[PDB]
Design an enzyme around this catalytic site. Structure first.
Site, PDB file in Angstrom:
ATOM      1  N   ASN B 190       5.936  -3.606  -4.348  1.00  0.00           N
ATOM      2  CA  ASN B 190       4.958  -4.401  -5.121  1.00  0.00           C
ATOM      3  C   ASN B 190       4.035  -3.520  -6.012  1.00  0.00           C
ATOM      4  OD1 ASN B 190       4.707  -6.295  -2.093  1.00  0.00           O
ATOM      5  ND2 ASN B 190       5.924  -6.852  -3.883  1.00  0.00           N
ATOM      6  N   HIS B 192       1.976  -1.106  -5.168  1.00  0.00           N
ATOM      7  CA  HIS B 192       0.716  -0.734  -4.535  1.00  0.00           C
ATOM      8  C   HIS B 192       0.972   0.567  -3.780  1.00  0.00           C
ATOM      9  CE1 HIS B 192      -1.502  -4.534  -5.000  1.00  0.00           C
ATOM     10  NE2 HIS B 192      -0.270  -5.010  -5.196  1.00  0.00           N
ATOM     11  N   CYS B 227      -6.354   2.639  -3.477  1.00  0.00           N
ATOM     12  CA  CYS B 227      -6.243   3.610  -4.564  1.00  0.00           C
ATOM     13  C   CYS B 227      -5.247   2.969  -5.552  1.00  0.00           C
ATOM     14  CB  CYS B 227      -5.731   4.962  -4.064  1.00  0.00           C
ATOM     15  SG  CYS B 227      -5.351   6.157  -5.382  1.00  0.00           S
TER      16      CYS B 227
END
Ligand SMILES: Cc1cc(N2CCNCC2)nc(C)n1
Ligand SMILES: Cc1cc(N2CCNCC2)nc(C)n1
Lengths: 268, 269
Positions: B190, B192, B227
């Site tokens: 995804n 991330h 992050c």
């Protein structure tokens, strides 16, 4: 995994993991390169190589020698999906006194279709002085034991991509990713940067739009010098064209070349 | 891998790979955390969760909700060697409206001995606004179908380490690793940053001499904020202590916004 019937090649099946796949839910080229290294290690262990991470022969240990990568070339037709089983077959070949080659064939376990192929060239190096050398007659005899004696090539075609000369990228680069540093997860059991990390670093300077709209078809990477645990690398890329790119990895400080390569991408 | 006889837990065996091990030829704590995530994903798929990388329930998809990690706690007694087979058993539990927990037990496949254990806490979040929320009645009912109804804990002890409050590291830090950035291999399907990357970043500010002479025994990591693909992180460490103990802080290198805090306990080899 296991050696094949004749004992001249090795096969292993892998189930693609959740963290091994990219945005299209298929294995990344770095996952593929990790799997090639893993099946290569399992083959070496099965034919009596050292179990210290260096994969050396008895003559090599006596002479303080190790193999280092000179080139990696990978061509993928289909990347396996998350949860799919991929079977990889690997074998080695002696190339006179020049060095040795390790070849790989990837197949879909369910269909039996070839989904990818790879080849790597390795050169002999003295472990202490870090000086390259030719393969001695005793090492060539050790390879006859477990390698097919008639040629068997993953890339047979005369004048094919896997053996093409790669030119040096001229400044200014079209794209760049600067200040890349390895962390502990990038190191192998001998505290050297894993060869797959350099593939990741090459790819970092490819724009995200190319990655989002294209599939990587072929990657050829020359290895010239190592990145140390405390070194910093800049990754440079220029479009040469399907989309084709020329790549250069160099140390951030003095600009010393560590790798050069090319990638070929196909629009999805 | 497969669900156990009762269908309330999941087991899977893993052969430790060549590139998964450190200098002592045993799996790194990052390899262990990757294996916990993998068996977690295989369990979710086996009990009917989404196959998009978010592992959501039917109610969560309708309400635009996802789970986010609040804490990861891992204790290793023995790290499996290169070529060894490790068996990992995982299960989940509903913790009222607070959130949910996923627990793990690691065993040596040959000896059957417990070699490690782990626990994780997850909180509900709206995927669009990124706002935390409580677990609704309908989501609690979905967890009753595949979770044990009597408590089953990897860490049962009274005021055990896994639930201890972690303080914030005060400047100046004793040790630091500056300008850490994620690359594409650090991202999940995804896009991330993978939770395991943050463990790697925490560990980067531990001196190499501690790593060379000690084994990591326990790691507790709180997750506060993510992050982003274009963010840069600083990793800070201060010794708090036969055993060595450290306090950790990950923050964005620009504004100094906290992303994680944690502690590690190490034992001399
Ligand atoms: C990775 C690597 C290193 C290397 N060396 C190392 C320093 N001495 C001469 C060059 N050569 C090759 C072909 N690959
Ligand atoms: C526990 C937690 C919360 C969180 N937030 C909540 C506030 N909005 C941004 C997202 N993010 C993570 C990774 N963990």
């Amino acid at each position: 995994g296991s050696l094949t019937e004749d004992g001249l090649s090795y096969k292993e099946k892998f189930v693609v993991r959740s963290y091994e796949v990219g945005s299209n839910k298929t294995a990344t080229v770095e996952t593929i390169a990790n799997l090639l290294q893993e099946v290569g290690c399992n083959h070496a262990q099965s034919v009596g190589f050292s179990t210290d991470g260096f994969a050396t022969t008895t003559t090599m240990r006596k002479l303080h020698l190790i193999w280092v990568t000179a080139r990696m070339h990978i061509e993928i037709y289909k990347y396996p999906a998350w949860g799919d089983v991929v079977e990889i077959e690997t074998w080695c070949q002696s190339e006179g006194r020049i060095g040795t080659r390790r070849d790989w064939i990837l197949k879909d376990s369910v269909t039996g279709e070839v989904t990818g192929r790879a080849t790597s060239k390795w050169v002999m190096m003295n472990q202490d002085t870090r000086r390259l050398q030719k393969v001695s007659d005793d090492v060539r005899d050790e390879y006859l034991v477990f390698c097919p004696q008639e040629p068997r090539l993953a890339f047979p075609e005369e004048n094919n991509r896997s053996l093409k000369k790669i030119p040096k990228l001229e400044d200014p680069a079209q794209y760049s990713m600067i200040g890349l540093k390895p962390r502990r997860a990038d190191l192998d059991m001998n505290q050297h940067v894993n060869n797959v990390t350099y593939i990741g670093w090459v790819l970092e300077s490819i724009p995200q739009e190319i990655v989002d709209t294209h599939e990587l078809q072929v990657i050829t990477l020359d290895y010239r010098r190592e990145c140390q645990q405390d070194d910093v690398v800049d990754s440079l890329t220029t479009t040469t064209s399907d989309s084709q790119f020329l790549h250069l990895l160099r140390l951030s400080g003095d600009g010393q070349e560590i790798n050069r390569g090319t990638t070929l991408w196909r629009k999805k």
